[PDB]
Every structure is written in C-alpha cells, then in structure tokens.
Specification:
This protein has about 30 residues and is mostly helical. It has one domain (about 1-30): Classic Zinc Finger (Double Stranded RNA Binding Domain, 2-Layer Sandwich), CATH 3.30.160. The protein is about 25% helix and about 0% strand. The chain contains one helix and no strands. Bound molecules: zinc ion. Zinc ion binds near residues 5, 8, 21, 25 and 26. It is classed as transcription regulation. Keywords: transcription regulation. The assembly is monomeric. Structure of a histidine-X4-histidine zinc finger domain: insights into ADR1-UAS1 protein-DNA recognition. The protein: yeast transcription factor ADR1.
C-alpha cells in the first residue's frame, strides 16, 4: 500500500524514504 512503514507507522511520499527508514530506524530487515 501507500509507502507507509507498518512498523513505526510512518509514511513517506517516496519509497527510498521508506527503505532508508528501515535501514535507519529499524536498521535491519533480515
Ligand atoms: Zn518504520
């Protein structure tokens, strides 16, 4: 769905923001 981190609930306009977020906040998707 719309670029929205179901983890922090955060949502961005771009995906990169969503990605870098996972690699920033949840730094780790493994
Ligand atoms: Zn998140």
């Amino acid at each position: 769905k719309a670029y929205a981190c179901g983890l922090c609930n955060r949502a961005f306009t771009r995906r990169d923001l969503l990605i870098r977020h996972a690699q920033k906040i949840h730094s780790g998707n493994l």
